[PDB]
């Protein structure tokens, strides 16, 4: 995969930093 999918959503981010901004850390 040329993307990083959010394990909480069906949303996939083109970059891992973008995904990190999407999730904005976790409760885990
Ligand atoms: Zn998410």
Nearby residues for ligand 1 (ion, Cβ within 5 Å): 6, 8-9
Residue 8 phi/psi, 5-degree rounding, is -110, -10
Discontinuities in the chain (C→N > 2.5 Å), after residue = none
How far from 26 is each of 1, 2, 15, CA to CA, in Å? 22, 23, 18
User: Cα(7) to centroid of ligand 1, in Å?
Assistant: 7
| Gap from CA of 23 to ligand 1 centroid (Å) | 5
Distance 2 CA to ligand 1 centre (A): 17
Buried b (16+ CB within 10 A) or exposed e, 1-28: eeebeeeeeeeebeeeeebeeeeeeeee
Structure determination technique employed: NMR
Rounded CA-CA distance 26/22 in Å is: 11
Q: What phi-psi label fits residue 25: left (phi over 0), alpha (psi between -120 and 50 degrees) or beta?
A: left
């Amino acid at each position: 995969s040329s993307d990083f999918c959010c394990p909480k959503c069906q949303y996939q981010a083109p970059d891992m930093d973008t995904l990190q901004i999407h999730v904005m850390e976790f409760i885990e």
